[PDB]
Nucleic acid binder design. Structure first.
Lengths: 108, 335, 228, 335
DNA sequence: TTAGCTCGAATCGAGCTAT
DNA sequence: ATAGCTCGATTCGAGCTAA
């Protein structure tokens, strides 16, 4: 919960940057997560990316952060074989569905 | 005391090349030297949602709203030219020999015992059954994985090369030789003798393998599929890319080698499925299961350990499987 | 002021000072023999204790890096499956019968290295006990990595007596063993003055070189070598 | 008492360059100066569970679950073109001279004694046996490490480049000259005398070595492999990285030097392995063991200490080993 | 605990011997 | 390997100072 709270805070403090930093040129700029990283691009782009962000409602960012957390957890096969990984996956699913519900209503 | 080594790396025999795809017309196979190559092409696809939902996405309003925005993708596709019904797939195969000698080992006593075991096998039962099965998988176009599943006629030609010229040529009908039975044929016997001479170290064996499959005018062929780093947008997702070397659709060499290794008809489960690729723990990706589990003591590692350390020679079929595993190579030997 | 000696280390001040802010300062540089480790500009109002406390952290991280770099290699006793570790022994050297090994079920106990490419042999509990007795590493075996091989050899024709700096690795309060010079002299059955004559600086006329038996018995009694 | 020096650094003779890999067809190798380079490219590999399991991963459910999640990764792969069967590998070799002189020496008396010892060696028998064995490893394509194991015809061309021009040309059949025996041949003798003049310091010699290997059309070639930091995603893992300098597959210069260094046939163990690289403690990476153990009193350091410090000259074979190790160079002496 | 220092006495190495 | 010697240099113990 503290990791997901800090992720939400980090997006909130990126919200104070320039509105159109996501439109800068670059080969790797994380376009999948740039919809969530810069909400303010929809103001300048009335028809380029505002409707895409409204209709798509990107919640795969939660899946990518869950994959990052899976990369950040210890690779213990004893937990994976036992139900400890089951409880860990259940609590991770609860925290990520809460986090996805947070990112769901960002268009209001 | 003869404990097994911590590193037992083996180099692969039966080295296959990348198999290139070109296309043309049937009865022009004798003049198929300058056939145009099959080129990987870009096309745009749009589809509706068809995956299973997890009982929470089954809301009709949400499903209809998802259909209002169908996914847009671009994919790589390989097709024949419209004036061409035959697929030509050509690769080369080197048969090396020296299967039982590891490329890396720790224990010299284990290496000597394993080489003695392999020499005992070769003396008692040479590379004959294995070579017959390899020649069978080479004479039926199993390396044409999805390219012969619905072909009207599949015809493969095997040539033997010494000085850049054909030393002996083989002509086969790949639909007559099925994907199931390892029968006996005089041309197949000669090809098996050549593979045996290659695997025994008697001489150099280089074979070019050209397979012709009459599929249809402008039909879709199926080359090897690569991976995508997925660093683009959601419109041009590039969800599918195909393998090519120089603007020519190709099949990965390891896929051809996997199709050539499909000789294992000795796994404990019922052989109604047919042959499977020779590999430790008999793990086929299609069914996602492992024939020759270590629990039933018929995997490669337990058989090799019993044959070399305890001198418990398995059945001739199981030692054929073990020697085929030595032929395919590997990084056998844990810490 | 004057140079501060902490075991093998030395904090010597600069001959000329400077003024940082409005206060006088000198640069104090830390050595490990001839190797300069760090320099700090310190106020002239610091005592020796504060100057030593300024470099205590660098000395501590040197000690940690020396313990991790020269740690003795570990042998592991495992079962037939080779997965469960039954006993761990740190050895000064490996058995000469170690070869590339994966445990079988032919023998119940196997002795294996902790290194990732594992070396080993089948071993009984009596043989494992004998090997652990005659190969074990003393608790301060990492200090031997900081000493040359010509002072740690048992060959008397290839042996060289340790210098004062090599003695101060193990003999002082600022050394790696932490025992005093009087305690080291008590361990050898020697007078404290005679043992101070061993660790006497170069600015001295009475200097004695330690003998083969005395040096090796000191290493035994300090827990550095030949103590299992 | 003339103890040994603490600093005994040596510089290497027989300096090779990086060996570049190009491709083409046999019987046009006389016009191979414009052959296209072999390019390192990417392909995708899909693998199953083929390594040993530690008695806890051998459960059928866990093994099948590991099958359902295969390891996807990309590998750097170098292949010949489908119309080219010959691999060309070219490097330049420079032989310096002055082997017994260290680059750094603490003791002047030990320096003088070592110089007298090496001068006594050269006066007794010069760099003739060592240069003959180096010329043998030049004549056979041992620097063509895995590209020689299955090549049908291997030919090595060695030129002497005096003023940027071929002052003397050698052409060899690298398969007639095996990897086991150091025989005598007139052209081998001439190249041996040239390398001897290089090692003695009589003149400057620069050798351009070009090797052609007839492997097959589209067959895999094996350049040197690099290190992977192992930080990216598991799907795009880059499990194998190949060495290239400018979009051209290359072999490391130290690998070429190690293959030329394989002249040591005098180690105490038997001649089953054949020659090994002249290294202190006779280390072979593939076998994971050390011939010439220090316990057996036949390593470089004990022989050098007996020869120089206390005038115990070993056998002429061990003298050849010691001088070849001085040619090899290294940071000798107590650190 | 560090860092030394005389002062006579015992020890140390490397020469020789004898049996 | 035993058994023992001489002779000059080095070590050794127990006083002492010096901090």
């Amino acid at each position: 919960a503290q990791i997901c709270d800090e992720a939400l805070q980090y997006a909130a403090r990126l919200r104070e940057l320039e509105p159109g930093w996501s439109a800068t040129p670059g080969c790797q700029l994380h376009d999948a997560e740039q919809l969530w990283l810069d909400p303010l691009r929809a103001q300048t782009d009335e028809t380029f990316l505002q409707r895409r962000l409204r209709g798509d409602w990107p919640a795969e960012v939660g899946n990518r952060f869950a994959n990052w957390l899976n990369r950040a957890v210890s690779s213990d096969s004893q937990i994976l074989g036992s139900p400890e990984a089951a409880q860990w996956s259940q609590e991770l699913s609860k925290e990520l569905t809460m986090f996805k519900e947070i990112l769901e209503d960002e268009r209001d | 005391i003869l404990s097994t080594a911590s590193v037992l790396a083996f180099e692969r025999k039966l080295d296959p090349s990348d198999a290139l795809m070109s296309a043309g017309a049937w009865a022009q196979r004798d003049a198929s030297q300058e056939w145009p190559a099959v080129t990987v092409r870009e096309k745009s696809v749009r589809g509706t949602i068809s995956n299973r939902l997890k009982t929470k996405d089954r809301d009709p309003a949400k499903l209809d709203a998802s259909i209002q925005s169908p996914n847009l993708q671009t994919v790589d596709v390989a097709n024949l030219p419209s004036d061409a019904d035959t697929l030509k797939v050509r690769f080369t195969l080197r048969v090396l020999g020296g299967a039982g000698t590891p490329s890396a080992c720790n224990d010299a006593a284990y290496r000597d015992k394993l080489l003695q075991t392999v020499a005992t096998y070769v003396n008692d039962q040479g590379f004959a059954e294995l070579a017959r099965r390899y020649a069978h998988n080479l004479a039926n176009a199993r390396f044409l994985w999805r390219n012969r599943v619905g072909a009207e006629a599949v015809e493969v030609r095997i040539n033997h090369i010494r000085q850049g010229e054909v030393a002996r040529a083989w002509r086969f009908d790949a639909l007559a030789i099925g994907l199931r039975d390892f029968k006996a044929d005089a041309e197949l016997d000669a090809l098996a003798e050549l593979i045996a001479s290659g695997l025994s170290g008697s001489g150099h064996v280089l074979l070019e393998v050209v397979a012709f499959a009459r599929i249809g005018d402008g039909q879709e062929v199926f080359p090897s599929q690569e991976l995508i780093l997925d660093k683009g947008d959601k419109k041009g997702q590039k969800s599918k890319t195909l393998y090519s070397v120089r603007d020519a659709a190709a099949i990965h060499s390891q896929k051809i080698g996997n199709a050539l290794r499909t000789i294992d008809t000795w796994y404990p489960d019922e052989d109604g499925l047919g042959p499977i690729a020779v590999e430790p723990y008999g793990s086929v990706t299609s069914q996602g299961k492992a024939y020759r589990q270590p629990k039933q003591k018929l995997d490669f590692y337990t058989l090799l350990d019993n044959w070399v350390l305890r001198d418990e020679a398995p059945a001739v079929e199981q030692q054929h499987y073990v020697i085929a595993n030595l032929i395919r190579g590997g990084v056998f030997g844990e810490a | 002021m004057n140079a501060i000696h902490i075991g093998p280390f030395s904090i010597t001040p600069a001959a000329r000072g400077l003024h940082y802010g409005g206060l006088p300062h000198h640069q104090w540089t830390l050595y490990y023999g001839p190797r300069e480790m760090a320099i700090k500009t310190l106020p002239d109002s610091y005592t020796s204790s504060e100057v030593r406390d300024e470099f205590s952290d660098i000395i501590a991280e040197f000690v940690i890096d020396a313990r991790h770099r020269y740690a003795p290699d570990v042998l592991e006793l495992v079962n037939s499956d080779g997965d469960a570790v039954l006993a761990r022994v740190a050895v000064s050297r490996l058995p000469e019968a170690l070869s590339g090994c994966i445990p079988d079920d032919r023998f119940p106990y196997w002795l294996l290295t902790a290194s990732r490419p594992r070396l080993g042999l089948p071993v009984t509990l009596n043989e494992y006990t004998a090997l652990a007795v005659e190969l074990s590493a003393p608790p301060l075996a990492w200090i031997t990595g900081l000493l040359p091989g010509e002072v740690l050899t048992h060959d008397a024709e290839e042996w060289r007596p340790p210098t004062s700096w090599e003695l101060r690795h193990v003999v002082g309060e600022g050394s790696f063993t932490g025992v005093s010079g009087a305690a080291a002299a008590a361990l050898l059955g020697m007078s404290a003055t005679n043992f101070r004559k061993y660790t006497a600086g170069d600015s001295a006329a009475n200097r004695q070189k330690i003998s083969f038996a005395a040096w090796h018995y000191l290493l035994d009694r300090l827990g550095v070598k030949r103590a299992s």
